[PDB]
Amino acid sequence: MPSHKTFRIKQKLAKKQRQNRPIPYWIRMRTDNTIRYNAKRRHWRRTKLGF
Amino acid sequence: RQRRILKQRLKVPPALNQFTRTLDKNLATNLFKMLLKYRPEDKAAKKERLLKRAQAEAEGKTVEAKKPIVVKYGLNHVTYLIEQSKAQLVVIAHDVDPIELVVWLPALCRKMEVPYCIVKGKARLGSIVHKKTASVLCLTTVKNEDKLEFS
Amino acid sequence: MGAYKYVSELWRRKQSDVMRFVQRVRCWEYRQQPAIVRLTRPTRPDKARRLGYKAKQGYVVYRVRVRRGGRKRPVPKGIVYGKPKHQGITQLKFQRNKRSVAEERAGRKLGGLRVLNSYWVNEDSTYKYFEIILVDVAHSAIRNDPRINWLCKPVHKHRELRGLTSAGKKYRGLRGKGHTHHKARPSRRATWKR
Amino acid sequence: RKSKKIRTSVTFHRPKTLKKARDPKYPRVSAPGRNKLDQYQILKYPLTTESAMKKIEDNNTLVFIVDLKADKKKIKAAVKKMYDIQAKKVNTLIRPDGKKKAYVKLTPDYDALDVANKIGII
Amino acid sequence: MSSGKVKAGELWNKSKDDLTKQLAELKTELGQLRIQKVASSGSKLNRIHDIRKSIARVLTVINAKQRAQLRLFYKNKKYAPLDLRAKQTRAIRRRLSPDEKSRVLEKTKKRTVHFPQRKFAIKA
RNA sequence: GCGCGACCCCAGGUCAGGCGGGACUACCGCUGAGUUUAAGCAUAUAAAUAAGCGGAGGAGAAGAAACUUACAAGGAUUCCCCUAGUAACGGCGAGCGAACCGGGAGCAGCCCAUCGGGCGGCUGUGCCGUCCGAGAGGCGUCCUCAG
RNA sequence: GCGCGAUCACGCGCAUCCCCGAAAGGGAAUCGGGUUAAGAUUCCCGAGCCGGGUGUGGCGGUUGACGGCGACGUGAAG
Known part of the structure; x- marks a missing residue:
């Protein structure tokens, strides 16, 4: 076996994974307004992945 | 193995579904009236030749000398030149479906005493009226120095 | 006038003389041929010549085959479920006519064309037969003819479906004008039930 | 030459067996449109990680990050043009980047070390 | 030149032949700003923005x-x-x-249909 | 007792040219419920709603009388206002429920029942060169006359 | 018709179609050693083989193969 292989789910899962990163120190500074608690940032233990 | 091989439409159909019944339609029926009989075409071919030389004797100068000939093809023009009583001989094709298109003329012409010939096939009537299409009916309105052969 | 009167006179009399023979014989064909038939000739040129027939490109004539009877209403053998003023399966008959269904079928299959008008080409004992005129919008010959370029206008696409055919006006009650006609004109949904 | 008199006996003389003729096609004249030059740049940058460098030394193989409508034949061509080297095998991965990580093993005739030096990479 | 470029008007006044050499040079240099990303210099910032535009300008201009x-x-x-x-x-x-x-509105029954007037007087 | 080339019906392909299939919020066209009400309920009512389905346009749709009519006149068609909760329907229970007209909004009457295609030429919504397929009637002074 | 020859370009033959449908039915070919923080029968090092696809020569043979009672062993379209 592969480790379920298909590129077409596999890439998009990897995109959401790259998309779930911290906000970049800068966008807090120039800035308009917010306690910038980003927020769409998701976790290995809790809630559940979607497509 | 060998011997025969021979003969599609007698034993291996389907191969054509529309037309077989179309032949059966011509041959069979039941049924009440109406269209049949004459042409041994000897007396077609003379009519056809004296229909070709009823478009094709056309001269007709600027001057009212004599314009010779008219032949007209197509059902409505043939009806109206019978009704307007100067058709000198009309021609009917037997090969007409809808039949309804040509039914009127044998009754109509015999009420005008205009003679009518019944050529077997529609395409030859269209070619010999010098169309580039078949013709269900045609007329001569005025022949051309032929009167004796026309009578 | 002309020759077109005789065939018109015949077609009155479906049951009689040459017309019952020749058209019962063309039903050997009509049963054989599909529920789309395009043909290159009108069966009735008279009622082509009086519903809009000019031979000219973009014109087609087509025969449609529609079942006889009413309408039968889903679901049988899992039946409604409701009080009996509203129970009905074969009892109801459509209040579109069988002529309009033929208009719909035809315009669905020839989707780039629009129904002009339609006529009657008989019945046997389960099929009712129509022949329908559909006229191209998109080609120059229809456009450069002022007797038939009114169809081209974008408002007139899919006109059979919105009931703007002659058949669609007639089942909509728009045959009268006056007295009576009062619930049909301008529309069966017209006042919004105020 | 072949006369349909032949053709008539051929339809009569075959119970089933199937039909037959074959035929050509041709273009018009209104000129189909579209002149193009649609080009992607397969190569995007030489990839840089500690794991690439050891691969430079140990086993003569440069490491690029490439496009996501790569293959191995286009990269085996792309690398060849732009760096003047023959490449012997190419190994291809989708990455958690969304990007395609390609290990390109080169000929010993021109070594990854001094191929690299003029666009240094670690 | 040896310094970076460009203006819109300058590309327009270059031939098809010139602009593609220019497009050539630009990808090559861009390709450098990729290895120079490992360096991370602020010069590779400004320049990697502005080269992007120069490519877009050459690509559009040739299309036009x-x-x-x-x-x-x-x-x-x-x-x-x-x-x-x-x-x-x-x-x-x-x-x-x-x-x-x-x-x-082109054809059939159309010449006299409206009120006449002034025109007849002018031609007197 | 027969083969062939050609006309004419059907069919498949083919590339061309042309259109259509999905969308935008409601508006705008068939099929078609029930809760509910009638203090129950079955006709009736909720409701030709909602919903489902299809399809159009910037608006649709409806249109120049086989009209109204109850007289003696009007004079295509929508819509607004009211005619009216009248007429008519209905356990004639509960409820249902208009039209003619009348005055406005705005007005308009017409129309059936040589065409296109291919190159070439142009100042390409056009026309020319060419090749191809396919309200009517007679007479009369005249008034009016395209662009 | 599709399918195939066929080189010069062209004609010939037939019956039930065409994709998805198992990463655990069926199936062309790889191992051993090494190395990485993290891969590995996947890269390397050694060695092997397969598949698919053009040339080359050894010759085994030539009016399409000898031997061994035999069994059996050591051209090419329709």
């Missing part, structure tokens, strides 16, 4: 030239499924362009 050229070659001849996009753009706008209105 080619469309213009095609239109000039063909205004003599017969043509276009492509310029036919542009004239319509599209299905709604194709419906609005038969044309309908002038043609619809």
